[PDB]
Amino acid sequence: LLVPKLTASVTDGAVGVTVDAPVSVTAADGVLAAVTMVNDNGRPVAGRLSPDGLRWSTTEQLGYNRRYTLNATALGLGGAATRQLTFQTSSPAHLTMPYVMPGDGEVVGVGEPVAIRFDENIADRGAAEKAIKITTNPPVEGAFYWLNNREVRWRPEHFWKPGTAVDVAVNTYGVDLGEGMFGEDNVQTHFTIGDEVIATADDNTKILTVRVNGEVVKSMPTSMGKDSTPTANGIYIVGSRYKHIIMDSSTYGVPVNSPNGYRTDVDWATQISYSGVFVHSAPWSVGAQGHTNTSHGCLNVSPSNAQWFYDHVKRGDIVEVVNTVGGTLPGIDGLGDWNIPWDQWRAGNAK
Ligand SMILES: [Cl-]
């Protein structure tokens, strides 16, 4: 008596079908006998019928700018039912690829934010945020905030609890990110939070003290930025580490041969700001370390102490600078995320 009815996730003649989800067909008042899908060059598209015969779905990634033809047939006590559908998928103007930090499988400090950097400007930040799923164990609240037009960050209100597992899924393939920009591919990554490592550089004492889970493990005399080019106060996130690097002021916009310029080859350099602040070996300022500031901003320490820092501090650990004559590190520096107040971070800037 009842005839089968066929329902698809697309309609005949549709355009702009997005490829961020499989295409599916479902039968009612009956079961699907067979479903086929082919592309505009005639090639079959891989699919699977559910065991109960009621639901069919594509099983392989669908492509941008293709035309697909779907043919389904179902059987019921009333009789048979058949339909054909043709539709076209999104045709992007541009592609953008996301790049996620930290690396897959890494162990990082309690200050490490999730970073998703696209290689193009993102017109629809809301769509980007919606395609990124952050899972945490233990679960903890967090929020997105854009540092510039290409890079978005995600972090909780306070530093991570040690031992937290973090899973990141950037599912932008098939997502319209605005102005015809679509994701080139998806990215999946996982990382773990390690020990709590907080080094405090106190200008009042000119000592850099490293505390691991509350325990003082190292005290390093330091020479920070001189009065005319002081080290900014605030919370710094540890980034990359270098056995040696040539610090070049022109990288930060200051000509080398200008009054505040510098080019210096140094050892055991740990970067803590995009603005150019490093902890590094400074044999020339050992006597000043612990007494007077002499740098253009870097935390100068002894060779042995700089190497200790390199060996025992990891990406995402924290350096806090206090009591300098400087201002405060900008929240959008690149490693200054924690200087943005939570109320402002949580409200976000997706526009
Ligand atoms: Cl083909």
Residue numbers in the entry: 57 to 407
What's the publication's text?
Notably, however, when LdtMt2 and 3 were co-crystallised using a precipitation solution at pH 7.0, we observed additional electron density extending from the sidechain of the nucleophilic residue Cys354. The results are in agreement with formation of the dipeptide (d-iGluNH2-m-DAPNH2), covalently linked to LdtMt2 via a thioester with Cys354, apparently reflecting a key intermediate of the transpeptidase reaction with the donor peptide. In the LdtMt2-3 complex structure, the m-DAPNH2 residue sidechain protrudes into the outer cavity, while the d-iGluNH2 sidechain is located in the inner cavity, suggesting that the donor substrate enters from the inner cavity. Note that no electron density was observed corresponding to the l-Ala residue of 3, which has previously been suggested not to play a significant role in substrate binding. Additional electron density at the entrance of the outer cavity was observed, in which d-Ala, released during the formation of the thioester intermediate, could be modelled. Notably, no conformational changes relative to unmodified LdtMt2 are observed in loop II, which encloses the active site (residues 300-323) and which has previously been observed to undergo conformational changes upon binding of various LdtMt2 inhibitors, and which has been proposed to undergo extensive conformational changes upon substrate binding. The thioester acyl group is located in the proposed oxyanion hole (the backbone NH groups of His352, Gly353 and Cys354) at respective distances of 3.8 Å, 3.3 Å and 2.3 Å, suggesting that, at least in the crystal structure obtained, no strong interactions are made with the backbone NH groups of His352. Polar interactions of m-DAPNH2 with His336 (3.0 Å), Asn356 (3.4 Å) and Thr320 (2.8 Å), as well as water-mediated polar interactions with His352 (3.3 Å to water, 3.4 Å to His352) are observed.
The established substrate for LdtMt2 is the disaccharide tetrapeptide monomer 1 (GlcNAc-MurNAc-l-Ala-d-iGluNH2-m-DAPNH2-d-Ala).
